[PDB]
Write a protein that binds this ligand. Sequence first.
Ligand SMILES: *[C@@H]1O[C@H](CO)[C@@H](O)[C@H](O)[C@H]1NC(C)=O
Ligand SMILES: *[C@@H]1O[C@H](CO)[C@@H](O)[C@H](O)[C@H]1NC(C)=O
Lengths: 197, 98
Amino acid sequence: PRDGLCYPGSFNDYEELKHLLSSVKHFEKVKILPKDRWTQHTTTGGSRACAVSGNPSFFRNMVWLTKKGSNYPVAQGSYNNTSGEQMLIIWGVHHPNDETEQRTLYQNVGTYVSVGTSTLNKRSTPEIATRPKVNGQGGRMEFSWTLLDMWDTINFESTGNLIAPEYGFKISKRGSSGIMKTEGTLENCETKCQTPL
Amino acid sequence: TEQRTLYQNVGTYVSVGTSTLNKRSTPEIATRPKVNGQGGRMEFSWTLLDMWDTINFESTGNLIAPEYGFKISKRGSSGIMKTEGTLENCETKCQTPL
Ligand SMILES: *[C@@H]1O[C@H](CO)[C@@H](O)[C@H](O)[C@H]1NC(C)=O
Ligand SMILES: *[C@@H]1O[C@H](CO)[C@@H](O)[C@H](O)[C@H]1NC(C)=O
């Protein structure tokens, strides 16, 4: 696929996530952390790697937290799963190219991005290093995911380099499915057995 | 104490980055049983560098930097034989450990 991660980076347990979708037939997006509540931080941050119409932009479902008025207070974020079914949540960590980028974007060094649920406990820290430029950007964005169970709570805590999510992907329909690796296009037709050919 | 006399810096890092790889590592100072008379350890990592790609090594200490890269030239069917024998003058088309 040509359109993957517009901002260079990786996706932890990406192959496992594609295996989960093989038994999921429908997602009902739920706004778990609206962009408006981040009133103590700047949420308009964008990159040329995500440019649309010649202007910097960013992923639609993710929020790039940034310093507001030369201040970066601790990012508090929580959501209690009340959607009635298991919900998939994706967050990310930003790795600046150099320590100067760290200062001009978050102003705090040695920041942490921690995510905790009733069954998950993770703390991540940015890795500042010199890397070859991909899509013109020297930084990287590492994205991680988890499944939030019934009536469970997920807490987001970070002093910097947190790409907080805005929407959760609630599973609604489950059943037999799969992924076709094909370059064809959908056509008006009906069948009971589909092959890539 | 070994940190001072060998690198003089504390909290050093060893970072390696390519177009598809991003790794930062730090030394782990601890007391371990002496193997080969040495209490220290060296952890060795590897990667495959693609066509026309760049790899950057940066470290403030504890880096065992390489001198040679192992370019792949010929590819094909091969294998690793687990045997105690020795090569001898002979020709064959099918080889078994026995
Ligand atoms: C989350 O919501 C459920 C149902 O409303 C409730 O039982 C549970 O106590 C809530 N979690 C917390 C941490 O309050
Ligand atoms: C590496 O070399 C190739 C071919 O010489 C070149 O196209 C590429 O730009 C070089 N990489 C960098 C980072 O300059």
